[PDB]
Design a protein around this ligand. Structure first.
Ligand code: DGD
Ligand code: DGD
Ligand code: DGD
Ligand code: CLA
Ligand code: CLA
Ligand code: CLA
Ligand code: CLA
Ligand code: LHG
Ligand code: BCR
Ligand code: BCR
Ligand code: BCR
Ligand code: OEX
Ligand code: CL
Ligand code: CL
Ligand code: FE2
Lengths: 137, 341, 334, 81, 30, 34, 451
């Protein structure tokens, strides 16, 4: 098996349009994910709140839905709770709160799209192993 | 005289690497066993037998490379290259695990040739063959672990694979499934190995700190001559020291060195006997009295019952990936887990 | 002389059947206290709450244990690294419930073993011999310090120190593997090469000397009587032993200097055990063995398992089952 | 002491290094080519990074027969092609 | 029954240590 | 004076020739990418 | 020259540095050359860390051990430990590195070109190991140098900007120390504290006032002791209880360095004051306590009553009592209830953790700090894979505390072996049987038999 464009095709927004990433964007988003997110989201789980993972089925049921590039990029700018009722920038890294999370200061708009694409491509490769925990290690 | 005595003369000539009649068996088998392992750990995979990568070519390092056992569907097949399984195909022979039997069988005969080499040289030199007798312990260990044990089981698959990390998996397998630490034959082996290492350290340290001053320099190594008649260290002072430090001490130098032979050899022979039992799943897994009491009394807890919980966790979490031919599908809800973890 | 000088002469006397010495002045009372408490506890001690969760573990013979399962149980996790002598408990019953005897035994033992090492130097000085036997003993001594003192310190509790029992030792080894992957640590591997190599060289040196014994006895009597205690002449032919082993491998791979040979017999297992003692001591600060979990992946990104991944599945099984009632949060950080 | 030429006199001679400064690098290059040309994969049947799974599969091609083992491996490889 | 057996064996070993040390064969230099 | 080809010559090269050949193969493997 | 051979010295090549015991000139070059190697590494390593330094990420995520030492002295950091000026880091590296060339030049000269013995050149610099007066004088000179060095830390804390204080209000800042603790009941009280849990001996010092006050005392004591040993000679009881030789003096200092090495290991493992967690990462206890608070905040936000929540064993799931009654975090972290940290102390009252402050006063920065320290626990593999031994590859992290603790325990242990080796030989050589037993005068042969 290879990393085909079909695997690198992820939804762009919640309307229906898609986008085909390059493998360079995939490897960039993976390196950026390990740089600013793996300390809590290694393997697609959440160490400080295991009830919420990075599985596509979980992101699709969030409010607003986060199972697309547009949803994830907006989350990395203005993160909210799973129901969209409270903004949690003071406790979650984001551009809006990059003053208290200094690692988010170096991220450009291109970087956010790469990080969002890696999160959507990875479950298509590892299946239940992404966000599944130690049972699937 | 005939060609036999002529060949005997050439085989026993004093050269840099002694050959002898035993060399006809030793050298090809030892070379093929060693070359088989280096070839497999460099180029050969375990993907079709185990679902594992195991060569440098696949990205493994020195700790993770291995020559893995054949698939469980092969049973106890000799896996000859010309046999009915490979049918003369060298490539298919590698992919089906034929290098494992190749290394184990040529290795088994290499050990025989080496022990015969110990006999052959001892006879020509004129010494007693106690070094050959001592080598029986590694042979019994090899035969019991790599041959007798899988022959008692379903197939070669459950023999130890030739690899660093693969041997480690073998160790953990015997804890969770056999409770091998609880076996008194392994305990006697542990005492023989650890006791052997103790004797080795304490004997060399005693000699090096009871030396006679036979030289003038600060380097005491030069003050020895391999043709001298006198002892190089004081047995009397060494006996006095240990009699006052430990209570007892050696007084006979011949008994001391035979004891250094006896302890490690007997230890390995004892653990070989235990492994033969485990070939038939004849384990020392449980204490019946502990289980009857713990079953009726939910407040009775010992380190014995705590270890069995660990063995049960090993079995359930390891078996699906370690025995892929069984198609073990364990749902998440059935896995034994403690709180939180 | 006065009373003090006569006492000093008796303490350092070389005529005592067992040497005392100044190190022995500390060693004798501390080892007797640890021994006497260990025997009483192993037989009659009530269960102790090792993990601090009100779940007492039975360790003594009178409470349903045999030789294999019996142990003196480590002190309670609620105590941690706090000093817990007898006079700090409200009663001996509280002291017994919380694992008090464990601290008394390990503390008196580690001190008496430390003075045992110093006692080895002292007699070597009184006898006019070289003094480095105690250096060889420092390797097993350092190992006992690691599992009884060093590892509890790094983890913050004597409840994670090695239990004083056969099955308890095995419990220590299994949990250690799940939480540190000690098998994949180079220092334990060097310790295995130290104990495997030591047993090999022990049988090797024993067989070669036994092989080259000079004929001094009859076939109807033990060959050991061919050596008399204190004789000046050596009892074996090292040149014949060198001639045999030199041909078993090659000439330059065999020893002809006995002092060089016996120093090697001392260096190999001692150094190997130093490393494995340092392994436990450094893994006490969570610098663990090699981690190659999911290190091999294919072109698409599928994980290609190795034997290291199979070891990790076994480690996971030990991890999720050990101390099944003591964890309330997802990460076992100590 | 035996009869062969000592190693110290060999590795320090000019004639030894005239030969082995060519044979040793040649054997090194030959091993390199064995991998870079991809021959090592075909000789031993070791999968390439893109030959472990089919594009849309997560099952291990495990051999389940003893006497049909050769035919199962060839069936597995044909699924990738 | 078991407890008495375990302790009895242990006590015999301790008594053997006493005789093996203080009532040993004295090493004599011929 | 001294012979060139001996049994020692054979035993040495049966180990040395594949070792260097193997070292070259493993060296090339460090530049393989997935 | 002199020796440089077995027959001329008695020692083999693998013990060749022992041929310098009586060659004071070349021995001086060895110590000065080795001193140059130490300053070289300090300068080179600092420049390496600076070149690989990224200010946007914490220091403990970058494998830095020397920059955290400079930041603790108050250089280059502002409020909260954030780096504001990397130039002081560059200056320290360059000055140490350039100074190594001067020490290297003198070490090579004194060991190769200089006179092999200083006793004929100048009677002041020349010395003999048996001269108990010259030895104590050289000891007194170096005691004074050590005394002034401890006062340099005091002058920095009081007159040249101060030190970084992790306990300062506002999340930490650089603070000048104006009132050092001079009370001997407090300074020497640390020496008499128990080394066990809840006490910690001198490792428990948790304020800069006690740190700088102690270095004032140590500075004066070293200078006073230096003057003492220059003007005096060892008394009778001291000259009968000690071996007076070069190897013996080395063995004494080997025991001392080994002792200091074990103490430093615990210091970097437990102390978060002189090893601020903002730079070195959280301690073992700190990260374990941070996990309990993380899920306390998590569950309480969901509506849970953390005070009355009974856990599976019967103990509280979040909060329980210590053996002496203090309200502490529940779970396995009960062992770490002696931990004190700036992010946790606002929640403590007279009886331990105050439930009212837990239900009302938890701030976002405290939830932030606890989540950061929980996910940076000092656990990692030898190949720098962060997390428990069963974690997958992803996070490239090993805490600097683990590196500093493990490395110095190894060094401390081997130096203890070095003490034993060199001290045992010093006894034997001074008595005259370090080379073996005299066949014509074996002591045991002149002793009565044991039985
Ligand atoms: C010390 C000195 C050391 C010197 C070194 C010497 C090295 C020589 C090495 C010899 C190689 C040994 C090959 C043995 C292979 C083996 O056995 O191969 C096994 C086969 C039997 O085949 C097995 O048979 C099993 C039982 O099957 C039977 O049952 C099945 C279910 O009912 C079906 O019905 C099946 O048709 C029926 O045959 C399964 O089929 C297995 O898959 C199949 O492998 O026997 C056979 O080849 C022959 C069996 C005859 C006995 C062989 C004697 C030696 C065996 C030693 C055993 C020691 C005891 C171990 C515990 C027992
Ligand atoms: C020769 C003459 C000397 C002989 C004297 C012998 C006297 C007895 C020796 C004591 C035995 C050591 C017990 C160590 C117990 C322990 O928990 O020691 C650790 C303590 C650290 O104590 C911890 O100190 C902590 C201090 O931190 C507190 O304060 C900090 C301030 O920032 C933080 O705020 C932190 O959160 C807060 O808790 C707490 O008090 C902890 O509860 C407490 O455990 O270190 C210490 O006191 C210092 C280090 C002790 C030495 C370490 C022993 C190593 C010996 C190895 C030898 C190997 C030999 C092999 C031979 C072969
Ligand atoms: C015959 C006798 C032979 C004896 C010789 C000695 C044994 C030979 C093998 C050891 C020599 C190392 C060779 C391979 C070195 C190498 O691949 O070394 C690899 C690394 C360089 O690799 C870098 O290693 C880094 C390690 O992570 C570090 O950097 C990361 C940056 O993101 C994180 O900050 C992480 O926390 C931090 O740990 C990252 O992995 C980088 O990606 C990677 O490039 O070298 C370094 O770091 C280490 C180099 C300096 C060594 C000093 C280490 C001393 C530490 C004290 C020892 C404590 C021991 C305790 C017991 C165990
Ligand atoms: C000391 C030498 C020696 C020994 C003991 C072995 C032993 C073995 N090898 Mg190995 N081998 C060797 C050298 C040796 N090898 C060398 C030098 C090579 C390189 C070419 C190989 C290459 C090799 C391969 C490639 C394979 C083996 C395999 C085997 C095993 C099966 C052997 C078998 O079935 O033969 C049967 C026994 C004989 C053929 C000997 C019969 C001789 C009789 C006594 C002659 C007289 C009777 C005879 C009928 C009359 C002769 C004429 C007649 C034939 C017409 C066995 C463990 C196989 C294996 O390990 O499978 C996993 C395998 O696949 N070997
Ligand atoms: C910290 C490491 C260290 C240091 C400083 C020394 C220093 C010394 N050793 Mg020792 N040694 C060491 C490690 C060290 N050794 C180790 C590890 C071993 C075991 C292999 C030995 C084995 C050993 C033996 C066997 C002997 C010494 C001797 C000596 C002396 C050298 C005598 C001489 O003329 O050398 C001459 C050497 C040379 C001409 C070679 C060139 C060396 C120069 C200094 C290299 C400088 C390089 C550097 C980049 C220059 C920068 C210049 C710049 C600053 C301007 C000297 C005092 C000898 C002695 O006792 O003398 C009486 C002696 O016999 N040593
Ligand atoms: C502690 C180490 C040490 C020791 C004990 C010695 C001792 C000696 N050296 Mg050596 N040397 C050293 C380090 C050392 N040196 C270093 C690091 C270098 C490299 C620069 C040299 C280079 C060197 C040479 C080139 C020569 C000597 C010579 C000598 C001898 C004569 C010294 C004399 O008369 O005093 C002279 C003392 C002074 C001139 C004092 C001035 C030096 C100070 C440190 C500078 C001023 C600093 C200032 C006061 C500090 C202000 C505060 C600041 C911290 C901010 C003597 C045996 C000579 C010799 O043996 O001839 C055969 C000789 O030719 N040495
Ligand atoms: C590291 C620096 C150093 C060194 C190596 C020495 C070395 C020496 N000093 Mg000096 N001293 C120093 C600094 C130093 N001093 C300082 C700074 C001062 C000023 C306070 C003094 C004041 C001083 C005096 C007043 C005297 C010495 C004397 C001596 C000599 C014998 C000391 C002795 O018996 O030690 C071994 C120590 C003892 C036997 C006493 C301690 C015994 C107890 C029971 C052991 C306790 C150990 C403890 C449990 C472990 C540490 C725990 C602790 C932290 C609580 C020796 C040459 C004596 C001498 O001969 O005069 C020249 C002497 O009378 N010194
Ligand atoms: C840290 C590395 C190891 C340091 C210690 C050296 C090995 C010592 C371990 C066993 C001690 C046993 C106690 C009885 C053994 C005993 O009594 O030994 C005695 C033996 C000879 O003693 P001599 O008195 O003849 O010489 C020692 C000194 O007196 C110097 O002349 O000592 C040695 O051979 C010293 C080894 C030099 C070590 C330098 C080389 C290190 C090589 C090993 C490290 C290799 C890399 C790893
Ligand atoms: C199987 C087989 C065979 C055989 C083959 C062979 C015989 C091979 C060989 C092979 C070989 C023969 C190989 C080799 C290789 C080698 C190597 C690969 C090596 C490496 C090494 C190294 C890596 C080293 C390292 C080190 C050490 C270890 C220690 C010290 C240091 C050093 C670093 C040096 C035949 C043909 C019959 C056919 C059938 C099958
Ligand atoms: C005696 C002896 C020895 C020893 C020696 C020694 C130890 C030496 C030392 C040496 C040294 C210790 C040296 C040092 C040097 C240094 C230098 C040479 C420096 C320089 C520097 C520089 C030039 C810098 C520059 C820079 C800057 C300024 C800025 C930034 C950039 C850079 C970095 C570029 C031996 C063993 C070998 C041998 C035997 C004898
Ligand atoms: C800075 C600081 C501080 C302070 C500290 C101090 C003040 C210290 C001191 C220290 C000291 C004050 C120490 C001492 C030590 C001592 C010793 C370590 C001793 C030793 C001794 C010996 C070793 C002896 C021995 C012997 C004997 C027993 C018998 C006879 C013989 C002889 C003499 C050998 C504090 C914490 C506040 C805070 C932080 C900072
Ligand atoms: O205690 Mn005894 O074992 Ca060291 O981790 Mn945590 O805590 Mn417990 O779990 Mn796993
Ligand atoms: Cl457990
Ligand atoms: Cl917990
Ligand atoms: Fe011997």
């Amino acid at each position: 098996a290879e990393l085909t464009p079909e695997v690198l095709t992820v939804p762009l927004n919640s309307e229906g349009k898609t986008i085909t990433l390059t493998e360079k964007q995939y490897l960039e988003g993976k390196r950026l994910f390990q740089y600013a997110c793996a300390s809590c989201h290694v393997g697609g789980i959440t160490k400080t709140n295991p009830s919420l993972d990075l599985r596509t089925e979980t992101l699709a049921l969030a409010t607003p839905p986060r199972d697309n590039i547009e949803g994830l990029v907006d989350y990395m700018k203005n993160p909210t709770t799973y129901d969209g009722e409270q903004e949690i920038a003071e406790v979650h890294p984001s551009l809006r709160s990059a003053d208290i999370f200094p690692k988010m200061r170096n991220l450009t708009e291109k970087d956010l799209v790469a990080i969002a694409g890696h999160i959507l491509v990875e479950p298509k490769i590892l299946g239940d192993k992404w966000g599944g925990g130690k049972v699937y290690y | 005289r005939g060609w036999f005595d002529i060949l005997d003369d050439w085989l026993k000539r004093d050269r840099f690497v002694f050959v002898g009649w035993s060399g006809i068996l030793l050298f090809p088998c030892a070379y093929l066993a060693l070359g088989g392992w280096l070839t497999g750990t460099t180029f050969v995979t375990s993907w079709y037998t185990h679902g594992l990568a195991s060569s440098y070519l696949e990205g493994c390092n020195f700790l993770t490379v291995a020559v893995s056992t054949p698939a469980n569907s092969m049973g106890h097949s000799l896996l000859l290259l010309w046999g009915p399984e490979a049918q003369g195909d060298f490539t298919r022979w590698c992919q089906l695990g034929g290098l494992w039997t190749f290394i184990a069988l040529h290795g088994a005969f290499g050990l025989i040739g080496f022990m015969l080499r110990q006999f052959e040289i001892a006879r020509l030199v004129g010494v007693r063959p106690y070094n050959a007798i001592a080598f029986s312990a590694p042979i019994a260990v090899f035969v019991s672990v790599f041959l007798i044990y899988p022959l008692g089981q379903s197939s070669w698959f459950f023999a130890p694979s030739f690899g660093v990390a693969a041997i480690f998996r073998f160790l953990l397998f015997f804890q969770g499934f056999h409770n091998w630490t609880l076996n008194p034959f392994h305990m006697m082996g542990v005492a023989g190995v650890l006791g052997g290492a103790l004797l080795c350290a304490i004997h060399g340290a005693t000699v090096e700190n009871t030396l006679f001053q036979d030289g003038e320099g600060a380097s005491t190594f030069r003050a020895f001559n391999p043709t001298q008649a006198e002892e190089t260290y004081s047995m009397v002072t060494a006996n006095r020291f240990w009699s006052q430090i430990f209570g007892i001490a050696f007084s006979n130098k011949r008994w001391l060195h035979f004891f250094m032979l006896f302890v490690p050899v007997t230890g390995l022979w004892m653990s070989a006997i235990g492994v033969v039992g485990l070939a038939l799943n004849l384990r020392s897994y449980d204490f019946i009295s502990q289980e009857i009491r713990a079953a009726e009394d939910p407040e009775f807890e010992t380190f014995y019952t705590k270890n069995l919980l660990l063995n049960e966790g090993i079995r359930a979490w390891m078996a699906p990936q370690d025995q892929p031919h069984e198609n073990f599908v364990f749902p998440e809800e059935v896995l034994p887990r403690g709180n939180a973890l | 002389a006065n009373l003090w000088e006569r006492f000093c002469n008796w303490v350092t006397s070389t005529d005592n059947r067992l040497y005392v010495g100044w190190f022995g002045v500390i060693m004798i009372p501390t080892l007797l206290a640890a021994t006497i408490c260990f025997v009483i506890a192993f037989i009659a001690a009530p269960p102790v709450d090792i993990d601090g969760i009100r779940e007492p573990v039975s360790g003594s013979l009178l409470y349903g244990n045999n030789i294999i399962t019996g142990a003196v149980v480590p002190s309670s996790n609620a105590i941690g690294l706090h000093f817990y002598p007898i006079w700090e408990a409200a009663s001996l019953d509280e002291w017994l419930y919380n694992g008090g005897p464990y601290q008394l035994i390990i503390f008196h033992f580690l001190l008496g073993a430390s003075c045992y090492m110093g006692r080895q130097w002292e007699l070597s000085y009184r006898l006019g011999m070289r003094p480095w036997i105690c250096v060889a003993y420092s390797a097993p001594l350092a190992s006992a310090f690691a599992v009884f003192l060093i590892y509890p310190i790094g983890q913050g509790s004597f409840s994670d120190g090695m239990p004083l029992g056969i099955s308890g030792t095995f419990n220590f080894m299994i949990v250690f593997q799940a939480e540190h992957n000690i098998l994949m640590h180079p220092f334990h591997q060097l310790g295995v090469a130290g104990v495997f190599g030591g047993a090999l060289f022990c049988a090797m040196h024993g067989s070669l000397v036994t092989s080259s014994l000079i004929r001094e006895t009859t076939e109807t009597e033990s060959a050991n009587y061919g050596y008399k205690f204190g004789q000046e002449e050596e009892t074996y032919n090292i040149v014949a032993a060198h001639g045999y082993f030199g041909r078993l491998i090659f000439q330059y791979a065999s020893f002809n200097n006995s002092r060089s040979l016996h120093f090697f017999l001392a260096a190999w297992p001692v150094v190997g055990v130093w490393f494995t003692a340092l392994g436990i001591s450094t893994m006490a600060f969570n610098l663990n063995g090699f981690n190659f979990n999911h290190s091999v992946i294919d072109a698409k990104g599928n994980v290609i398992n190795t034997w290291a991944d199979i070891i990790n599945r076994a480690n996971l099984g030990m991890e999720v089952m050990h101390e099944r009632n003591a964890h309330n949060f997802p990460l076992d950080l100590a | 002491t035996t009869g062969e030429r000592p190693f110290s006199d060999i590795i320090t001679s000019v004639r030894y290094w005239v030969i082995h400064s060519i044979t040793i690098p040649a054997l090194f290059i030959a091993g390199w080519l064995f991998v870079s040309t991809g021959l090592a994969y075909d000789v031993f049947g070791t999968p390439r990074p893109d030959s472990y799974y089919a594009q849309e599969q997560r099952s291990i091609p495990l051999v389940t027969d003893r006497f049909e083992a050769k035919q199962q491996v060839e069936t597995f490889l044909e699924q990738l092609k | 029954m078991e407890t008495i057996t375990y302790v009895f064996i242990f006590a015999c070993i301790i008594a053997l240590f006493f005789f093996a040390i203080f009532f040993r064969e004295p090493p004599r230099i011929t | 004076s001294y012979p060139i080809f001996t049994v020692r010559w054979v035993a040495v090269h049966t180990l040395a020739v594949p070792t260097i050949f193997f070292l070259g193969a493993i060296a090339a493997m460090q530049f393989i990418q997935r | 020259a002199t020796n440089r051979d077995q027959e001329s010295s008695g020692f083999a090549w693998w013990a060749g540095n022992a041929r310098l015991i009586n060659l004071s000139g070349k021995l001086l070059g060895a110590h000065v050359a080795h001193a140059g190697l130490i300053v070289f590494w300090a300068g080179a390593m600092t420049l390496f860390e600076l070149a690989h330094f990224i200010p946007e990420k914490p220091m403990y995520e970058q494998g830095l051990i020397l920059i955290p030492h400079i930041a603790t002295l108050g250089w280059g950091v502002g409020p909260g430990g954030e780096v504001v000026d990397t130039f002081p880091f560059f200056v320290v590296g360059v000055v140490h590195l350039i100074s190594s060339a001067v020490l290297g030049f003198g070490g090579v000269y004194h060991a190769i070109r200089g006179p092999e013995t200083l006793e004929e050149y100048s009677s002041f610099f020349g010395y003999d190991w048996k001269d108990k007066n010259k030895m104590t004088t050289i000891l007194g000179f170096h005691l004074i140098v050590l005394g002034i060095g401890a006062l340099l830390l005091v002058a920095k804390a009081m007159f040249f900007g101060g030190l970084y204080d992790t306990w300062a209000p506002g999340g930490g800042d650089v603070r000048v120390i104006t009132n050092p603790t001079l009370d001997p009941r407090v300074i020497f009280g640390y020496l008499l504290k128990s080394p066990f849990g809840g006490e910690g001996w001198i490792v428990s010092v948790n304020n800069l006032e006690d740190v700088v006050g102690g270095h004032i005392w140590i500075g004066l004591i070293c200078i006073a002791g230096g003057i003492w040993h220059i003007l005096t000679t060892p008394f009778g009881w001291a000259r009968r209880a000690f071996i007076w030789s070069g190897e013996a003096y080395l063995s004494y200092s080997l025991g001392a360095l080994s002792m200091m090495g074990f103490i430093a290991t615990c210091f970097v493992w437990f102390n978060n004051t002189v090893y601020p967690s903002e730079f070195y990462g959280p301690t073992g206890p700190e990260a374990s306590q941070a996990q309990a608070m993380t899920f306390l905040i998590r569950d309480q936000k969901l509506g849970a009553n953390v005070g009355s929540a009974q856990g599976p064993t019967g103990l509280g799931k979040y909060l329980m009592r210590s053996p002496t009654g203090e309200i502490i975090f529940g779970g396995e972290t009960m062992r770490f209830w002696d931990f004190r940290g700036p992010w946790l102390e606002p929640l403590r009252g007279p009886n331990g953790l105050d439930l009212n402050k837990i239900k009302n006063d938890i701030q976002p920065w405290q939830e932030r700090r606890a989540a950061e320290y929980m996910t940076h626990a000092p656990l990692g593999s030898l190949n720098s894979v962060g997390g428990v031994a069963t974690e997958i590859n992803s996070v490239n992290f090993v805490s600097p505390r683990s590196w500093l603790a493990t490395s110095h325990f190894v060094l401390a242990f081997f130096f203890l072996v070095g003490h034993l080796w060199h001290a045992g030989r010093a006894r034997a050589a001074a008595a005259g049987f370090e080379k073996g037993i005299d066949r014509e005068s074996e002591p045991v042969l002149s002793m009565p038999s044991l039985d």
